[PDB]
Design an enzyme around this catalytic site. Structure first.
Site, PDB file in Angstrom:
ATOM      1  N   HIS A  91      12.647  -9.862  -0.147  1.00  0.00           N
ATOM      2  CA  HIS A  91      12.868 -10.811   0.938  1.00  0.00           C
ATOM      3  C   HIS A  91      12.688 -12.213   0.360  1.00  0.00           C
ATOM      4  CE1 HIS A  91       8.534 -10.165   0.803  1.00  0.00           C
ATOM      5  NE2 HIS A  91       8.478 -11.440   1.094  1.00  0.00           N
ATOM      6  N   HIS A  93      11.368 -16.512   1.373  1.00  0.00           N
ATOM      7  CA  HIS A  93      10.802 -17.557   2.217  1.00  0.00           C
ATOM      8  C   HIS A  93      11.559 -18.863   1.966  1.00  0.00           C
ATOM      9  CE1 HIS A  93       7.257 -14.957   2.768  1.00  0.00           C
ATOM     10  NE2 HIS A  93       7.593 -14.568   1.564  1.00  0.00           N
ATOM     11  N   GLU A 103       6.481 -20.604  -1.474  1.00  0.00           N
ATOM     12  CA  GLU A 103       5.081 -20.310  -1.219  1.00  0.00           C
ATOM     13  C   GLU A 103       4.207 -20.724  -2.387  1.00  0.00           C
ATOM     14  OE1 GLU A 103       5.054 -16.164   0.486  1.00  0.00           O
ATOM     15  OE2 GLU A 103       4.818 -17.383   2.314  1.00  0.00           O
ATOM     16  N   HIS A 116      10.872 -12.677  -3.146  1.00  0.00           N
ATOM     17  CA  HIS A 116       9.808 -11.731  -3.425  1.00  0.00           C
ATOM     18  C   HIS A 116      10.381 -10.324  -3.556  1.00  0.00           C
ATOM     19  CE1 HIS A 116       6.620 -14.597  -1.604  1.00  0.00           C
ATOM     20  NE2 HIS A 116       6.909 -14.873  -2.875  1.00  0.00           N
ATOM     21  N   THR A 195       1.343 -12.555   1.431  1.00  0.00           N
ATOM     22  CA  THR A 195       1.341 -13.915   1.972  1.00  0.00           C
ATOM     23  C   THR A 195       1.606 -13.909   3.480  1.00  0.00           C
ATOM     24  OG1 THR A 195       3.681 -14.395   1.601  1.00  0.00           O
ATOM     25  CG2 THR A 195       2.163 -14.825  -0.216  1.00  0.00           C
TER      26      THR A 195
HETATM   27  N1  LIG Z   1       5.295 -11.994   1.055  1.00  0.00           N
HETATM   28  S1  LIG Z   1       4.781 -10.843   0.286  1.00  0.00           S
HETATM   29  O1  LIG Z   1       5.715 -10.633  -0.844  1.00  0.00           O
HETATM   30  O2  LIG Z   1       3.391 -11.013  -0.068  1.00  0.00           O
HETATM   31  C1  LIG Z   1       4.963  -9.434   1.339  1.00  0.00           C
HETATM   32  C2  LIG Z   1       5.511  -9.605   2.613  1.00  0.00           C
HETATM   33  C3  LIG Z   1       5.640  -8.492   3.441  1.00  0.00           C
HETATM   34  C4  LIG Z   1       6.196  -8.782   4.818  1.00  0.00           C
HETATM   35  O3  LIG Z   1       6.347  -7.880   5.608  1.00  0.00           O
HETATM   36  O4  LIG Z   1       6.493 -10.031   5.117  1.00  0.00           O
HETATM   37  C5  LIG Z   1       5.247  -7.199   3.062  1.00  0.00           C
HETATM   38  N2  LIG Z   1       5.463  -6.122   3.942  1.00  0.00           N
HETATM   39  C6  LIG Z   1       5.111  -4.757   3.527  1.00  0.00           C
HETATM   40  C7  LIG Z   1       3.635  -4.553   3.729  1.00  0.00           C
HETATM   41  C8  LIG Z   1       3.051  -4.244   4.886  1.00  0.00           C
HETATM   42  C9  LIG Z   1       1.638  -4.163   4.503  1.00  0.00           C
HETATM   43  C10 LIG Z   1       1.662  -4.417   3.192  1.00  0.00           C
HETATM   44  O5  LIG Z   1       2.850  -4.732   2.659  1.00  0.00           O
HETATM   45  C11 LIG Z   1       4.771  -7.007   1.769  1.00  0.00           C
HETATM   46  C12 LIG Z   1       4.606  -8.136   0.956  1.00  0.00           C
HETATM   47 CL1  LIG Z   1       3.873  -7.852  -0.605  1.00  0.00          CL
HETATM   48 ZN   LIG Z   2       7.064 -12.822   0.620  1.00  0.00          ZN
END
Ligand SMILES: NS(=O)(=O)c1cc(C(=O)O)c(NCc2ccco2)cc1Cl
Ligand SMILES: [Zn+2]
Ligand SMILES: [Zn+2]
Length: 256
Positions: A91, A93, A103, A116, A195
């Protein structure tokens, strides 16, 4: 109801997710003059040749391009990592203007966007288990700056019109994420967190030094997405980034 607005934005998250004020939160500012070259880092391995995309989803805060991770197809290994981490989604930002949207920052510099690629550590068997571990995820982060178009991005921007609002998805097969990588895999790495809520501290961050360039027209189409759901008043999906968090005791290492 967390989000990026004045009433539900990043300064509010800690109320429902108190780990927001944790000891290893992301993103961070990368001070290039404090990050140290670490000769012990192994070479980084991005093996995306067999990656199988499935779908693209507007989830109310960004859009996910999702991959079949049921087998060992697209993987990330080496660098600071121990073992194999499977790609599950990527995805972005981005900001409302080119001067903001990433970020991580680099000597306080903000890029227009940040990509990311999220991976989970296959020793834990599934994603859900991996996010209960301090080494359960690895996220490859890539800065976007505006200049020339990134051809490898255009299939993504062209499908955005079909997933304008929260909850909408579209089929999105055969997308090759190798098309989003810069020439150089030089990187910085540190231990950190999601994040976005729930902000779990389960992530090894690998942030590439070299940005990719995308055109103004490609990022403009990111900014036409909506945070809102269908038929609701329009809230453009812009500025969906968390600002830099305190580095605390951590050390950022450079691979170069
Ligand atoms: N923005 S981010 O790359 O830190 C990130 C962003 C997201 C997101 O959903 O924005 C995400 N969703 C899956 C999740 C749910 C619980 C752990 O990871 C995972 C990550 Cl690592
Ligand atoms: Zn992210
Ligand atoms: Zn959301």
């Amino acid at each position: 109801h967390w989000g990026y607005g004045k009433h539900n934005g990043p300064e509010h998250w800690h109320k429902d997710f108190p780990i927001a004020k944790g000891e290893r939160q992301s993103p961070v500012d990368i001070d290039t003059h404090t990050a140290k070259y670490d000769p012990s880092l192994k070479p980084l391995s991005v093996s995306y040749d067999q990656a199988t995309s499935l779908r693209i989803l507007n989830n109310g805060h960004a859009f996910n391009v999702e991959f079949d991770d049921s087998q060992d197809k697209a993987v990330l290994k080496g660098g600071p990592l121990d073992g194999t981490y499977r790609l599950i989604q990527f995805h972005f930002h981005w900001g409302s203007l080119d001067g903001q949207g990433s970020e991580h920052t680099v000597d306080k510099k903000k890029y227009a966007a940040e990509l990311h690629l999220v991976h989970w550590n296959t020793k834990y068997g599934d994603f859900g288990k991996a996010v209960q571990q301090p080494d359960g995820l690895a996220v490859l982060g890539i800065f976007l700056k505006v200049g020339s178009a990134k051809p490898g991005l255009q299939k993504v921007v062209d499908v955005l019109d079909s997933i304008k609002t929260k909850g909408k998805s579209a089929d999105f097969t055969n997308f090759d994420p190798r098309g989003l990588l810069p020439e150089s895999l030089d990187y910085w790495t540190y231990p950190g967190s999601l994040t976005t809520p729930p902000l779990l501290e389960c992530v090894t961050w690998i942030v590439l030094k070299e940005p990719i360039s995308v055109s103004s027209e490609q990022v403009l189409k990111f900014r036409k997405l909506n945070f809102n759901g269908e038929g609701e008043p329009e809230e453009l999906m812009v500025d969906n980034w968390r600002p830099a968090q305190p580095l605390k005791n951590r050390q950022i290492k450079a691979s170069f």
